[PDB]
Design a protein around this ligand. Structure first.
Ligand SMILES: NC(=O)c1ccc[n+]([C@@H]2O[C@H](COP(=O)([O-])OP(=O)(O)OC[C@H]3O[C@@H](n4cnc5c(N)ncnc54)[C@H](O)[C@@H]3O)[C@@H](O)[C@H]2O)c1
Ligand SMILES: NC(=O)c1ccc[n+]([C@@H]2O[C@H](COP(=O)([O-])OP(=O)(O)OC[C@H]3O[C@@H](n4cnc5c(N)ncnc54)[C@H](O)[C@@H]3O)[C@@H](O)[C@H]2O)c1
Ligand SMILES: NC(=O)c1ccc[n+]([C@@H]2O[C@H](COP(=O)([O-])OP(=O)(O)OC[C@H]3O[C@@H](n4cnc5c(N)ncnc54)[C@H](O)[C@@H]3O)[C@@H](O)[C@H]2O)c1
Ligand SMILES: NC(=O)c1ccc[n+]([C@@H]2O[C@H](COP(=O)([O-])OP(=O)(O)OC[C@H]3O[C@@H](n4cnc5c(N)ncnc54)[C@H](O)[C@@H]3O)[C@@H](O)[C@H]2O)c1
Ligand SMILES: [Zn+2]
Ligand SMILES: [Zn+2]
Ligand SMILES: [Zn+2]
Ligand SMILES: [Zn+2]
Ligand SMILES: [Zn+2]
Ligand SMILES: [Zn+2]
Ligand SMILES: [Zn+2]
Ligand SMILES: [Zn+2]
Lengths: 345, 345, 345, 345
């Protein structure tokens, strides 16, 4: 089968031919119908040799949608042909966090060597993929697979981050979204669907600001040195109830601390090496909590799928072939994918 | 009347003789029965002239209990003789936060120049004090005033910090308490009363470790370079569900980040200028939130008083006269008060 | 001044001339700009002499908006001319419930004879009204008073009822609204604004079904014997996550129990003498909780006003003069006010 | 193997000899070390033929602990020898409720015919039992099996009921526990461990009131006509924040409604044919929610075990042989087991 793999430290992903896999006991083989590119793939491929821990080669792609092709021995709950999305942050399934479907916060996964598809286990950017267990599949019914693939991360991660502090986001609240890319442009729509928050979007690029308005942002602000003041002008000196930073650079985190309200929240979702919020007296308002959330929970993925089926999400995508896999990643690096890049095998 | 005041930037507090205040409309005059010393007083008195903002002179004492002595015009809801504790973090009373009793997170107080007694307004460390409004008094009934004064902050503050994440502290959880002083020793007892968390205490002083055990900590380990390893030995690789740092030095925050669990919590309660948690990827576990909480809410103060009335709080105190005020603050600076220092005018 | 009063048991309200009131200490005098009619007014007037406890005469009107006309001694926080809404369920202001702004659940108000305007205290259906304390006024800025008056109950009450179980109403959830009248037509709109719930409206009146669709209901079905089956056809055998019954007749409550989901919720909001949910095994699904909520909290009222200011609420009203007061109550009785009747003095 | 089975409508259970089961794919065979008797078993056996739905014969016992004796094909996560407690309310594992581990509220189980061991599937009152899947096993380590068995229901069910409203039970709150039997005597101890509530116990029998005090009730009161007054005598006319009714007869539910506080909670846990709370205006206080909860969640069972391991639970048991099975049910019917009856095969 055809797949797109990271094969050498510091090199670009390449199209390879590798054996179509066979599902073992408990496992499920999907024919992949759509595979999303995530900016985290770029972070991974940029890691120095001394830090990269996912193994080589690695079939990329941790946003996966497909149809069930073959059932491993003993698998129940799905039949051949079923359209499903892959729950990515695999956990042990048995610890206290896993018991609540919070497998993203599994306390055993690291020790047991359990890794996500595309991030340690073979990913979805191939004609076929293996899923470890039936509980990491979620039915999507007749959802267009291309729009559905981003739901597994671009949808799921912001959904989780927002969900952590949803009770803060009542009428009169303001939510700031920094970074209107794959995650950001979906995060705006989630905010509008599950809360009455006023949504202020922030990006370096005017066209991304335009995208922000297209998907529902009430306001759009240019990132950089003037952004904090501009956000405050919109909120009055009260500041923003919550800031969801899908960039996570030191500059954006700094902006977030300068606009967040007393008893508010900063979610640092974007990943930038060494960048960090500075949480201490006189450096952040009283009671404004900060967190680096990770991916999302099982029930949350189901909720994201429900938003999509209700027509509440307009996922902006561009489609590529598998052969275009490497070219798509160059486009992602350069910031020319207006939304989510999705490979259709 | 006799009072203890901060009078000169960089000097020691001095016992003075100022006029006895008279309650204006809405105000209540208390005969002060007990005034707690707080380590925050030391921070305030150590601020450079360029940073000190509370005005000179200042009557110290933001932990106050007393008996209703005189009602200002219009005041209803209390009678002369009523024993009361004073709610410290005064708010505008009208904003969204205040409307929920969360006056500590009032978004108007700073602009309106509303300040706490002993931290901008005349404090409790005098024979008498003024309270601005009935809603800032809470009934204590027949509670011993000496052990009651500390409830207003030594109790309230850790109680609020713990309350922010109470749902995390189920059976099986671990709470670490760094700093077993005024706040810490009460924080331990709160944890034991409102949760099933296992409580691990940390301090530099072995006698304070003993105190931690006396008030019900399950374990108590020396602070410093070996603390994180010792803590982890006790919890196993899982780490602590929540860390309540009542020291807030960089070293103690660092320890906090080194032991906190995935999806856990760090509460930086102690105040050390420039000290801050570093919240970013690869520097703290996924999902581990961090906050600097501030004082507490009105209903929380009521709840702390209810804990004390139910005999759940063994508050350790040393009693001083007003004249001993300055000396008591020296005792606190050097760390020789086993618990809370309390002045009885 | 002119006012509409209930003056004798079993009779209709009448237009009377009574003295314009003078604000005492702490009180505020409003020039009333809008007074809403509530169906609870009909319940009150329909009570037998032996049950009616609100005293006679009684100036009706517990939905009130006005401008501050006169300040009582020592009142602060408002100036003459300020546009305000009246928070109705007055509480003691000092109990644990009140300290959280939940004055609707005040545990002292009964004992202290603290009653709401229009429901024991003189109401808003008059040229002027007295408000007991500044904490019972909420600023409405430039909101049109006619549309604003219903926010104080028709908005507040459903808002509170929904807010009790907001975390249940995630994507994929369903909320049934029974009764598309004053409260119901606003409750529909609150659901769409603060949740991703699908909204199914239920009413006896075909024109009210149309109103439900006009204000955002995803579906509307005829009430009565066939309604449960029809609701279930819409939701599949899962049933409705939550049912908000703004009628509260035995028949509508029976419908609610027949459609509510496992671990769902029934909020019996509407008031019908003797009607009640029957909560017992085999009579209702496991975990489906039931409550009769009352009015709403202070912070909730602020949140309702914020919804209105953000253009999230389209309140359907019909305007009457004071002289038309009694005629308007007759219209309310016959069910010919499409939304909320509002008197403009 | 020997087992205790319900074999004939209206008859007592009998000791039988039936084949030892063999684990199918995914299933686990346990050697049973302890099997708890529950009063629900009596309710089941008292069901008329027309209502009884669990099939005959039925091996009784929905409280089970044992050691892993054999793994079915492809089972992972447990080894032969492992000591485990059985999670009883089996769900589909894949719906939105199950994804959160709330299998007790699975919306698919009825339609799929998924039934609990002892309540439709073969129970634990036998030398060996089958568990359908690994996710329904929780490790107990070296916990004594006799005292562990009750954790799976007598512990889990009260734990879940209390957990639904735990935020209500702060310092100053009162929890009433009606019925100090298998569940009740554990419920009292859970309240003391996970909250600061004052616990008032109610029972018909003085010796059960003695039991209540032995396990930490703050007060004990005779059930019946005088109970409501006696509870209010203890709580002051304020009422009880929460009432956990482990009897659930019309009379005890009536008592609960007569004592519950405004904005409080009644949990109808006990099962008595036809009895129900009557939730309507003037029949119950404002905001006081009522629910019939069912069993408990996966993470809750883990928490219960964690309480036991930390020594927070003193489970009163009497031990029986399998041969004494029927005799023990006679003892339970007459109310002469002082706590929980446990069969040790
Ligand atoms: N925490 C998690 O569990 C997790 C999950 C998924 C993605 N991520 C991270 O989230 C981030 C976003 O991922 P993506 O795939 O949506 O990225 P993307 O490449 O699709 O979009 C990046 C967007 O951010 C904007 N941007 C860059 N710098 C900015 C700045 N200084 N200020 C404002 N906007 C700026 C760009 O213009 C672009 O619109 C990445 O860092 C990724 O690694 C984290
Ligand atoms: N966030 C808030 O609203 C707020 C409110 C009250 C107090 N505080 C702060 O809390 C802190 C504690 O106040 P307090 O009155 O309890 O002080 P305290 O003087 O009574 O007690 C200090 C304790 O901390 C211990 N300690 C100091 N350094 C330590 C370290 N490196 N490791 C372990 N233990 C150490 C000491 O041995 C002593 O037992 C102060 O910084 C105070 O300003 C903050
Ligand atoms: N619990 C509280 O705090 C609270 C607060 C305000 C109002 N209420 C109660 O809410 C109820 C509604 O008040 P309102 O002013 O909105 O009433 P309304 O007269 O404005 O509207 C009544 C609506 O209910 C519909 N209706 C009547 N019977 C019905 C039935 N059998 N099935 C379906 N629809 C039916 C009518 O067609 C009409 O559309 C009243 O009982 C009032 O007492 C309770
Ligand atoms: N909802 C659920 O998921 C679930 C789960 C387990 C048990 N239950 C039910 O809970 C109830 C208790 O079960 P158990 O096994 O603990 O019972 P048990 O037989 O062990 O104990 C019953 C206790 O209730 C007392 N009692 C009986 N009538 C009383 C009254 N009128 N007032 C006060 N006390 C009274 C008895 O004296 C005894 O102490 C049963 O009805 C059972 O079916 C429900
Ligand atoms: Zn990603
Ligand atoms: Zn796990
Ligand atoms: Zn202090
Ligand atoms: Zn305020
Ligand atoms: Zn009303
Ligand atoms: Zn009150
Ligand atoms: Zn049972
Ligand atoms: Zn299920």
């Amino acid at each position: 089968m055809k797949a797109v793999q990271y094969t050498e430290i510091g090199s670009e992903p390449v199209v390879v031919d590798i054996p179509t896999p066979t599902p073992g006991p408990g496992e499920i083989l999907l024919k992949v119908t759509a595979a999303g590119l995530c900016h985290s793939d770029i972070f991974v491929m940029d890691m120095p040799a001394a830090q990269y821990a996912y193994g080589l080669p690695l079939t990329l792609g941790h946003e996966g949608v497909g149809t069930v092709a073959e059932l491993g021995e003993g698998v129940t709950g799905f039949g051949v042909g079923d359209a499903v999305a892959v729950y990515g942050p695999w956990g042990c399934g048995a610890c206290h966090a896993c018991a609540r479907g919070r497998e993203n916060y599994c306390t055993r996964a690291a020790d047991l060597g359990i890794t996500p598809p595309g991030l340690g286990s073979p990913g979805s950017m191939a004609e076929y993929m293996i899923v470890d267990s039936a509980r990491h599949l979620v039915p999507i019914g007749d959802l267009d697979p291309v729009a559905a693939a981003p739901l597994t991360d671009a949808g799921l991660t912001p959904y989780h981050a927002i969900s952590r502090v949803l009770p803060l986001l009542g009428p009169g609240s303001t939510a700031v979204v920094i970074g209107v890319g794959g995650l950001g442009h979906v995060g705006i729509q989630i905010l509008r669907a599950v809360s009455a928050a006023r949504v202020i979007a922030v990006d370096l690029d005017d066209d991304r600001l335009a995208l922000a308005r297209e998907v529902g942002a009430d306001a759009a602000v240019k990132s950089g040195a003037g952004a904090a003041d501009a956000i405050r002008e919109l909120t009055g000196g009260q500041g923003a109830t919550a800031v969801f930073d899908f960039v996570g650079a030191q500059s954006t985190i700094d902006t977030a601390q300068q606009v967040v309200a007393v008893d508010g929240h900063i979610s640092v979702v974007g990943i930038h090496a060494g960048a960090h919020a500075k949480v201490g007296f006189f450096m952040i308002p009283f009671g404004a909590s900060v967190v680096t959330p990770y991916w999302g929970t099982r029930s949350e993925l189901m909720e994201v799928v429900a938003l999509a089926r209700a027509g509440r999400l307009d996922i902006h995508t561009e489609t590529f072939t598998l052969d275009e896999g490497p070219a798509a990643y160059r486009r992602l690096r350069e910031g020319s994918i207006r939304g989510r890049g999705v490979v259709v095998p």
